[PDB]
UniProtKB/Swiss-Prot annotation, chains A, B:
It comes from the Eukaryota. It is found in: Golgi apparatus membrane. The gene is MYO5A. This is Unconventional myosin-Va. It comes from Gallus gallus. Processive actin-based motor that can move in large steps approximating the 36-nm pseudo-repeat of the actin filament. Can hydrolyze ATP in the presence of actin, which is essential for its function as a motor protein. Involved in melanosome transport. Also mediates the transport of vesicles to the plasma membrane. May also be required for some polarization process involved in dendrite formation. Neuronal and non-neuronal cells of the brain. Belongs to the TRAFAC class myosin-kinesin ATPase superfamily. Myosin family. May be a homodimer, which associates with multiple calmodulin or myosin light chains.
Length: 49, 49
């Protein structure tokens, strides 16, 4: 029982932590994709230039 | 103890999966940084052009 309450505290904390990393990584993955939208465009414009 | 053996299996699995994400995240974060190394350079060369 002393063990049963202690892992309930732990199993909650990581299930917030990886949600926080998932929310940040959805931003970073979107941000990397939209920086790809930047990087594909200059290989057109600077080739026109 | 039926509950103890079942979460010992769970508490092992996430300790692999978050490591698997962490190693990939170290790659993406390095990769995004090295596509900042690209991004700083064309805004000098295409400025000179």
């Amino acid at each position: 029982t002393n063990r049963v309450l202690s892992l309930q505290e732990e199993i909650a904390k990581l299930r917030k932590e990886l949600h926080q990393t998932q929310t940040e990584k959805k931003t970073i993955e979107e941000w990397a994709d939209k920086y790809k939208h930047e990087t594909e465009q200059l290989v057109s414009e600077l080739k026109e230039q």
